[PDB]
Amino acid sequence: GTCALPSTYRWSSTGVLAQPKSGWVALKDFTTVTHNGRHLVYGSTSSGSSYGSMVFSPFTNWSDMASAGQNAMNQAAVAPTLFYFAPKNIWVLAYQWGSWPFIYRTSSDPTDPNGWSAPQPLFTGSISGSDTGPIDQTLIADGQNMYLFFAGDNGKIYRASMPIGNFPGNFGSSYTTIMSDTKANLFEGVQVYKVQGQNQYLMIVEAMGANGRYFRSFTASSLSGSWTPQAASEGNPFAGKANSGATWTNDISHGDLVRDNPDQTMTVDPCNLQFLYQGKSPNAGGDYNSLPWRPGVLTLRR
Ligand code: EMC
Ligand code: EMC
Numbered sequence: 294g295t296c297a298l299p300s301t302y303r304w305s306s307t308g309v310l311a312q313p314k315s316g317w318v319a320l321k322d323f324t325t326v327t328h329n330g331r332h333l334v335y336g337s338t339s340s341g342s343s344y345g346s347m348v349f350s351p352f353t354n355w356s357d358m359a360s361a362g363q364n365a366m367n368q369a370a371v372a373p374t375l376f377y378f379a380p381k382n383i384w385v386l387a388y389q390w391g392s393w394p395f396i397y398r399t400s401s402d403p404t405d406p407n408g409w410s411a412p413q414p415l416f417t418g419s420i421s422g423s424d425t426g427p428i429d430q431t432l433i434a435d436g437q438n439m440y441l442f443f444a445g446d447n448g449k450i451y452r453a454s455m456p457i458g459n460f461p462g463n464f465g466s467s468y469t470t471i472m473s474d475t476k477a478n479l480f481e482g483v484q485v486y487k488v489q490g491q492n493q494y495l496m497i498v499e500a501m502g503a504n505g506r507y508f509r510s511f512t513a514s515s516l517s518g519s520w521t522p523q524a525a526s527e528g529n530p531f532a533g534k535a536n537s538g539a540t541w542t543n544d545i546s547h548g549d550l551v552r553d554n555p556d557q558t559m560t561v562d563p564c565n566l567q568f569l570y571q572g573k574s575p576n577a578g579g580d581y582n583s584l585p586w587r588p589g590v591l592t593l594r595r
């Protein structure tokens with residue numbers, strides 16, 4: 294009863310799923326798990342002038358995201374990663390921009406935007422040839438090791454690791470440069486997942502295409518292994534204008550595959566693949582930080 298990842302992806306898409314509440318011009322950079330039978334979604338916010346973060350009130354159906362309460366975090370967790378860390382029975386929210394390059398907080402109740410612990414260092418390193426520094430972290434563990442993957446708006450993807458018994462904790466300053474390409478080809482928004490029922494991991498990376506933002510996919514048999522391009526061009530992307538089925542956006546940008554199991558393995562079911570992404574009206578212009586990003590969901594057509 295197991296499925297494999299397709300070689301060519303075809304999606305159908307929702308329309309815009311929610312509008313930002315008063316004071317925000319964008320909802321961005323989503324991370325999502327199922328918690329108590331409901332969708333739990335964190336994201337970045339932008340007022341145009343500054344970035345923050347928020348969590349939606351839990352909702353059962355994506356069609357009800359539009360009415361879900363939008364709960365601001367009193368301390369910004371930009372480009373967040375949410376998961377349940379089973380070995381310690383604790384939830385983890387990792388993010389960027391704060392006292393360290395990457396940061397995390399912990400909680401026993403991930404629905405509360407302000408129930409998170411004092412911030413702790415996740416990563417303290419620096420990268421060369423990057424205007425942004427380390428950005429868009431994700432975290433993923435197998436049975437043995439916890440991995441940190443991140444980008445740099447510079448064509449590189451980076452990786453750090455620790456024995457899983459040492460997490461939650463600080464990866465420190467060290468990293469491995471695992472991928473190197475043009476800036477456009479490996480830009481940001483890196484995510485990594487375990488493919489359920491297969492000895493395979495899936496990496497997606499946001500790229501800058503001629504037509505807009507899209508995702509390129511890569512596979513590996515191990516988290517410390519080499520990554521093989523899968524659906525890795527604008528014409529044959531993991532998800533993009535070419536195959537999204539979205540009518541409201543030419544961009545498929547920073548989000549998260551829908552994770553039914555909320556745990557640190559980041560496991561996805563290839564039989565039921567869905568992608569919570571950010572998109573925007575093709576007519577929207579102005580400064581990047583003011584762009585009206587919105588949530589959408591892609592569902593894989595099999
Ligand atoms: C409330 C965690 Hg099964
Ligand atoms: C739209 C079913 Hg989570």
Ligand SMILES: [Ca+2]
Pocket residue numbers: 322323324372373374429430431482483484548
């Ligand atoms: Ca992310």
